[PDB]
């Protein structure tokens, strides 16, 4: 019941800055510290640095002390860091986690990924890819979309609103040579649900507050 | 206080028994030792805290110990569900830091399994648009060393296509790929045969799909 919910991530010109937020739940958000972790693409963990909500001081890693700050407002539940004079190499997941027990992190944030980029932010262009087999062949058929040019990441990709999951391959997005992204997602399904169960692609591309639903229909 | 984790990558059958070692320069308190799960695109999980205490929720068959200087966590018995990159923890009571071992991805041995092939046009929507990405998508495969090669009109391209490759799947730990192959409108409606031809270490043969322009 206890939950870490962060929000604030998205693309930032270099030299700028950017807030993000946890939002805490299930439990005495004064009773527990919280804490900022870093994991570059690819890379591995980074501590940053943590507040006491019951205080509202806060202990940084020498790397991050003069550049972030982490405030947290009781009221709301919420533990904030703020990020000042940005740079390439900050693009990254960032995370929130409570502390509990001998200094160990119980609960986690889903993460929320900053990209420090002087490019403007792009949307994505969203197309089918039409399902291989006819209502007729008697197996399993592939059917997917399309997700073009885009900046930056992420895009979420969901089939059905989320209902549809078994199945379900959304690849890794590649940048392409226009310096944008592109990625596919393709379910399989059987051939004779074809007729009659709708199938949706969501997209989702927050940088740019795109929101696509679209059909994948046969032929 | 700077932690080693070894190895980096590691690969087991199910079934087998892995373990991943953190050594802590210095000294640290078998307290304030910890071992995080984190599956591809997820945060990480608490595993074990305190060197040796199973989380709530997690499967005896994780187990940790500490000899001297090293600390080490333990799969008695690999499940395709523990595919994961493991990271220890450590907390120093001087100054409160905190510091992370480097990361162990293990990766699960399986049976090979042949990928199946799909091939798609591009949609009439993105053609309006002026380009034409053509797809061949490689479904549920092991060993992960595929090759994909796209011929138009039997003429062997290069240099215009870009793949991806998913992470293994943490039910039957196979791998798919997807293969874009991209041309401007004018090329595309320049040729008539688009197939991919896929090479896998499950294929006896290769395996060839295709369309023509049209039909």
């Known amino acids: 019941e206890v939950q870490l919910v962060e929000s604030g991530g998205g693309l930032v010109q270099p030299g700028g800055s950017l807030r993000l937020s946890c939002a805490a739940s299930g439990y005495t958000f004064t009773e527990n510290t919280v804490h900022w972790v870093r994991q570059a693409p690819g890379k591995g963990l980074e501590w940053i640095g943590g507040?006491?909500?019951?205080?509202?001081?806060?202990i940084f890693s020498p790397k991050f002390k003069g550049r972030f700050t982490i405030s947290a407002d009781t009221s709301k539940n919420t533990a904030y860091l703020q990020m000042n004079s940005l740079r390439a190499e900050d693009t990254a997941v960032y995370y929130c986690?409570?502390?509990?027990?001998?200094?160990?992190?119980?609960?986690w944030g889903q993460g929320t990924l900053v990209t420090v980029s002087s490019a403007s932010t792009k949307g994505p262009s969203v197309f089918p890819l039409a399902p291989s087999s006819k209502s007729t062949s008697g197996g399993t058929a592939a059917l997917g979309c399309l997700v073009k040019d885009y900046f930056p990441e992420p895009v979420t990709v969901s089939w059905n609103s989320g209902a549809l999951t078994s199945g379900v391959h959304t690849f890794p997005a590649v940048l392409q040579s226009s310096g944008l992204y592109s990625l596919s997602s393709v379910v399989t399904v059987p051939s004779s649900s074809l007729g009659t169960q709708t199938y949706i692609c969501n997209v989702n591309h927050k940088p740019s507050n795109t929101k696509v639903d679209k059909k994948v229909e046969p032929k | 206080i700077q932690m080693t984790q070894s190895p980096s990558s590691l690969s087991a059958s199910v079934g087998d028994r892995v373990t991943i070692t953190c050594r802590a320069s210095?000294?640290?308190?078998?307290?304030?030792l910890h071992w995080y799960q984190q599956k591809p695109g997820k945060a990480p999980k608490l595993l074990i805290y305190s060197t040796s205490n199973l989380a709530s929720g997690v499967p005896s068959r994780f187990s940790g110990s500490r000899s001297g200087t090293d600390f080490t966590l333990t799969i008695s018995s690999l499940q395709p569900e523990d595919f994961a990159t493991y990271y220890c923890?450590?907390?120093?009571?001087?100054?409160?830091?905190?510091?992370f071992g480097q990361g162990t991805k293990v990766e699960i041995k399986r049976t090979v399994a042949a990928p199946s092939v799909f091939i798609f046009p591009p949609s009439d929507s993105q053609l309006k648009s002026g380009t034409a990405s053509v797809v061949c998508l490689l479904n549920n495969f092991y060993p992960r060393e595929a090759k994909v090669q796209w011929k138009v009109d039997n003429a062997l391209q290069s240099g215009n296509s870009q793949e991806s490759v998913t992470e293994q799947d943490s039910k039957d730990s196979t791998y798919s790929l997807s293969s874009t192959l991209t041309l401007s409108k004018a090329d595309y409606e320049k040729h008539k045969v688009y197939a991919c031809e896929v090479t896998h270490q499950g294929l006896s043969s290769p395996v060839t799909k295709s369309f023509n322009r049209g039909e």
């Open positions: 923890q450590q907390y120093s009571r001087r100054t409160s830091y905190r510091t």
């Open positions: 210095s000294s640290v308190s078998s307290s304030y």
């Open positions: 986690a409570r502390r509990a027990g001998a200094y160990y992190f119980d609960y």
């Open positions: 507040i006491n909500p019951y205080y509202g001081g806060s």
